[PDB]
Amino acid sequence: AKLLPPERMKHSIKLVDDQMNWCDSAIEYLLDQTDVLVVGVLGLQGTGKSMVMSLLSANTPEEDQRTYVFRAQSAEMKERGGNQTSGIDFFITQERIVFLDTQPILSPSILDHLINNYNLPHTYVEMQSLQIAAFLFTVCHVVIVVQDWFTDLSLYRFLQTAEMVKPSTEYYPHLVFLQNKARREDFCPRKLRQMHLMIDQLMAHSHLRYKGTLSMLQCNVFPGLPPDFLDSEVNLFLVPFMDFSLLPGYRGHPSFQSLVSKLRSQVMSMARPQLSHTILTEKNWFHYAARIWDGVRKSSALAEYSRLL
């Protein structure tokens, strides 16, 4: 009976400190096994990336927010409008699945905190966001994009420009679109079709894999909507708020727990293509990620882009 599991991480560990330094402390939790999956997310200040990762890795909606593996925002902290997660986080579930939680992009709180501390801090924050995005797009299998309100018109531009600053027949990780805090109007066939068409027209030359995967229609979310109603069902998912005389007792959308579970099941079965032309193990992947991070830090394209602005 010497086949005991390595360990069960009760909490996540910071992989990248606030000073943007590599932390070599997650190797003890890795093994010499192959076929591993990694997940990353890019979002705004209050989209809810930490909550999504907690609910999808080792947490349930019934559990209290204070026991989440990923530190989530608090009501007492939303008054000052500050960020909660800094750097990059690391955590591996019991199913040998690696999760990665990052800090918000273009967060005004980070800039404000940096003011009271090379040309202007704006370019510094911009390059930091570009570096994190490039690293994620380089060592990740699937990247989930969280959003609060649709029609941002700014996240797509950032994602498109982030693909041209990566370090290095190329590898393109899957991009999953998620709409957090969705309202009842968003769960309508007309709104769904409009959202699909807008995303298609906005990502015409994305050059990334964003179609034919994670079909919301195939998940029985819309029992009556036919598959031919949508011209091209892209990988979009919706998550509503946590659990009227004209329409009393009408919710207009399924339960939050059901959608969360469906998203977790769909993400857990994502494809795991080879990142490079060689089989990588957990330790090998960690070393490759560290080398990629070191190379992207002292790069040339990022410096040129920062100098141009």
Partner 1 sequence: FSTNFRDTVDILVGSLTQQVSGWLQSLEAFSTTLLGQFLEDMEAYAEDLSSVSLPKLAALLRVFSTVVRSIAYVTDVLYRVMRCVTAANQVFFSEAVLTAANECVGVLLGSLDPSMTIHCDMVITYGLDQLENCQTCGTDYIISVLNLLTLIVEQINTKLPSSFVEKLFIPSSKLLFLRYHKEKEVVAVAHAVYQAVLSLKNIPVLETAYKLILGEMTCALNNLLHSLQLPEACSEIKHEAFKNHVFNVDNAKFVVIFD
Give me 43's structure tokens: 């979002």
Would you count residue 4 as binding partner 1 (CB under 8 A)?
no
Tell me which of 14, 29, 73, 213 binds ligand ATP, using CB under 6 A. Answer: 73
Stretch that binds partner 1, among 41-49, 114-122, 239-247, 268-276 (CB under 8 A): 239-247
Would you count residue 50 as binding ligand ATP (CB under 6 A)?
yes
| SS3 state at 304 | helix
245 binds, among partner 1, Mg ion, ligand ATP, none (CB under 5 to 8 A by kind): partner 1
- DSSP-derived letter for residue 37 is E
What track of x and - describes contact with partner 1 for positions 173 through 192 (by CB under 8 A)? -----------------x--
Stretch that binds Mg ion, among 20-28, 66-74, 128-136, 272-280 (CB under 5 A): 66-74
Would you count residue 3 as binding partner 1 (CB under 8 A)?
no
| SS3 state at 134 | helix
Q: At 40, phi and psi to the nearest 5?
A: -140, 160
| SS3 state at 278 | strand
Smaller CB distance to Mg ion: residue 73 or 128?
A: 73
Would you count residue 102 as binding Mg ion (CB under 5 A)?
no
Name, in order, each residue with C-beta under 8 angstroms of 213's C-beta and a sequence gap of 6 or more. Answer: 174, 176, 235, 270, 271
Q: At 25, phi and psi to the nearest 5?
A: -135, -5
For residues 188 and 167, give the distance between their C-alpha atoms in angstroms, rounded to a whole number: 41
Smaller CB distance to partner 1: residue 5 or 224?
A: 224
Write the CA distances from 276 to 139, 159, 171, integer angstroms: 10, 22, 8
Stretch that binds ligand ATP, among 158-166, 171-179, 215-223, 238-246 (CB under 6 A): 238-246
Interacting residues with ligand ATP between 117 and 176 (CB under 6 A): none
> In 45-170, at which residue ranges do the beta strands (DSSP E only) sit?
88-92, 97-102, 142-147
What track of x and - describes contact with ligand ATP for positions 165 through 184 (by CB under 6 A)? ---------------xx---
Stretch that binds ligand ATP, among 81-89, 90-98, 201-209, 228-236 (CB under 6 A): 81-89
Would you count residue 289 as binding ligand ATP (CB under 6 A)?
no
| SS3 state at 261 | helix
| SS3 state at 28 | helix
Smaller CB distance to Mg ion: residue 77 or 279?
A: 77
β 97-102/88-92 pair status:
antiparallel
Binding site residues, partner 1, CB under 8 A: 190, 245-247
